[PDB]
Symmetry: C2
Subunit: 410 residues, 2 copies
Amino acid sequence: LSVHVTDLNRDVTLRVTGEVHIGGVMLKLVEKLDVKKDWSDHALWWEKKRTWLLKTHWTLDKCGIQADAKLQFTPQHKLLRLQLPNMKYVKVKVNFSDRVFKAVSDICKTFNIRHPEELSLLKKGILAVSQPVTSPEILAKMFKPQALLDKAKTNQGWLDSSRSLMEQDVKENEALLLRFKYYSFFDLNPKYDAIRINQLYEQAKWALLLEEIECTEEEMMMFAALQYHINKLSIMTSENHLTTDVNPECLVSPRYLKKYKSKQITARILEAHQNVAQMSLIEAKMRFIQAWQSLPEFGITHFIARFQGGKREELIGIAYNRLIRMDASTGDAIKTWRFSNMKQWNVNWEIKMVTVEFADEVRLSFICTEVDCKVVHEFIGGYIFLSTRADEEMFYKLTVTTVVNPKYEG
Amino acid sequence: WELSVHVTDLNRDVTLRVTGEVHIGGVMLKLVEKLDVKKDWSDHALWWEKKRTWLLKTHWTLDKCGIQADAKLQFTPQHKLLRLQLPNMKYVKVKVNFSDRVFKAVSDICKTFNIRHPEELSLLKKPPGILAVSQPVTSPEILAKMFKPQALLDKAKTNQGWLDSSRSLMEQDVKENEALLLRFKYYSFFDLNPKYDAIRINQLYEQAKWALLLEEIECTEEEMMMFAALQYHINKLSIMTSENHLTTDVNPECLVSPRYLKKYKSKQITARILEAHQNVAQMSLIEAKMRFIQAWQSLPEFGITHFIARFQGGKREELIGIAYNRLIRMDASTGDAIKTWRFSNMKQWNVNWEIKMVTVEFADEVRLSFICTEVDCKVVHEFIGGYIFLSTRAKDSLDEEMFYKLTSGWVLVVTTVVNPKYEG
């Protein structure tokens, strides 16, 4: 066996038996290297079969390791460049051993964001602050084609939530996108979700500005006025001074005039107004999200799909309440099936075909790319799992595989 | 015999020779003929002040109306001018039918003011953009001048001025050009919808604001400062509704997608954004007032109307409280609740007009009986039946006959009314 230490950039070849557990090898590593350091975090990684040495209690043989195998001793927590929905990169170190689902959970607990199951990871202080862009040129610089096929192509980058980061080709300090994957936001509470709402509003703002989602001019002007309103509401949160021609003594009962001087009353009102503006700021972003949620093209994830009796590449669209057969160019809905009528769905991994069973004996089938099937399967099962909130074991189970919809009405 | 009639608007007294078999319309005809004038008598109607009744039934004879000889009645236009003080404390002149029952008068007024659900409002005796805009006073001096005694007995005295919704203004000693208060009478507001109730919400907010500023309702210092902060915020949001100019350090072009930079100039964008911003601030304005109201609704002493009453085993004049869902026996010195009765457990309630006594029958055959003043008896009766009628409101056109049936009392459209919402 050969174990490569990435940190010290040195490879160690060891004499291995086969009756010594994985922990024994790790222990032998600590003693032999003759270096005063901390090895507590590191874990063995197998690049060949792309599996972690998860259980260190296991011996050598029941892991299926041949002779002269080149293992890797690398730290679990590596540098990871994350781009928040606010399009600002933050540097964090997360566990590359845990499942992406549990990884997202930890990241959101760190970022003060409730319900991490609505979020996931996607390939390519200031958590609460939201400000517009310095100049229109930056938007044009960030401007992408954002066509349906281009958007559908980027949807392949959704990580397997049942696997880890290391198993899915994620290098150290490689850019991953933290995005709201599912568009079923349960319990948006301004009392707890000051950051959660802010990032969701940011994702909605950037999706509209970069024309990732299509809307009319009237709606565009409204959204533009909304974040203008949000900007003015934000300024009020910092202001600790009188800004209008109103005398604060006119806003209170005359008994407090005898209890306080004017400077005292002005101070307590300004302090309270910062709290008032703080809630108005949040509820404003709430309205932005509401208007965003009410768009006719909201909450649809596109995947290239081949439908029965179709000679052209089309699109399968996945939403929180339905899935849609769509036109690849226009994006017009050909037919819409709803999740409330679904009994179960099947996934043939050989043919790469998804078959969905609905009520009243209607049946849908389509075919996708190899990578898309796993992503679509997780998208489907994920959306059903989110329709049951009122349990991590439930999610992993829902995500030739056959899964019965636990919310079938019929 | 002879009939003397005074035409109010013409300032003329007319004597008419009548028998008694002459119809009401007959008097009106002989009145017009003898005057010999060219005028529109459409709105004019006979009024008898001594007996406080309109004489609208034209087909009736003088015998049916019990009009004795030498009676001096009036021929006056039904619609007269009235001064109303809105919940925003601003006065306004309106023309209303002084022969219509107050309940209809209030509804017509609310229709004019574009206020939905007029059954929650009514007129109270004093002890177009004026309806929409909210503005704080100029100085603390104004608040000090309007500061009236808010003691519980003083509020109980004020509540004697609530007009009978089953009778008309003329029948209740309300002269032309006099001042009446338009207030939210019942504290149970059905469907406060911001999409329609911009005026309704504004006035309700004003009534809440003024009740707090004049200490008509109690609140903690923390709550008071929060209410003050809300006012400051609402005033600021109100300013934004008029602003048609940039007031921040943000470029409006960074708020739109790049395709609009190719279609519009910088000014065309800034203008259409500010135009939309006024509507955004408008909605924020309404939502801010809603938060003020719901906070006002959550106050411990909210939604209670007080009346002086003597109870069965009382040693004193006490206070009977009427909330939206309950009757409360309160001490008139501390305002503490002695005993509370739920409306849901009320099978029935009676009003003995002779002894001026109200008796309520409950479940488990528990009984409550108290005595008020002559005026308070019908006012309290309307409050009980009114709040009940409000409970019959479903999300599904108001049933006027139902409202009167619950609140008319001794007026036709010992009184006994069965609660239609008696649970079990």
